[PDB]
């Protein structure tokens, strides 16, 4: 076979969240409902590493963030927890799309939260999962 075999790129929708494998729907839905009632100005977020990414692991998965925090500021928060420089690449994906840095986390949540009331974000060193 004379071909360049393309086997190292992540195909759409292949992401799987450990958080959802380990905690069943009714228990996530329960907690997400409660936290959204108790803190209406904040959103609950799950962050895990995208398929095939080459990048440092994240220590913590679950974040409770102000609705008015921007995506650009959440990139800063995550960079710091993984000990990346500002010059090191980092991309987020929500429902397989790269969100704009100008959006707020509250806008992302309203448009994209799942039915357990959490917003799910994947991260990588490259953009390709979202293209």
Numbering used by the authors: -13 to 117
Pull text from the paper.
Mammalian ATG8 proteins comprise two subfamilies, namely LC3s (LC3A, LC3B, and LC3C) and GABARAPs (GABARAP, GABARAP-L1, and GABARAP-L2). ATG8 proteins promote autophagosome formation, elongation, and closure, as well as fusion with lysosomes. The canonical LIR motif is a small Θ0-X1-X2-Γ3 motif, where Θ represents an aromatic residue (W/F/Y) and Γ an aliphatic residue (L/V/I) (whose side chains bind to hydrophobic pocket 1 (HP1) and HP2 of the LIR docking site (LDS), respectively) and X represents any amino acid (aa). In this study, we examined the molecular determinants that regulate selective binding of the centriolar satellite (CS) marker protein PCM1 (pericentriolar material 1) and the ULK1 complex to GABARAPs.
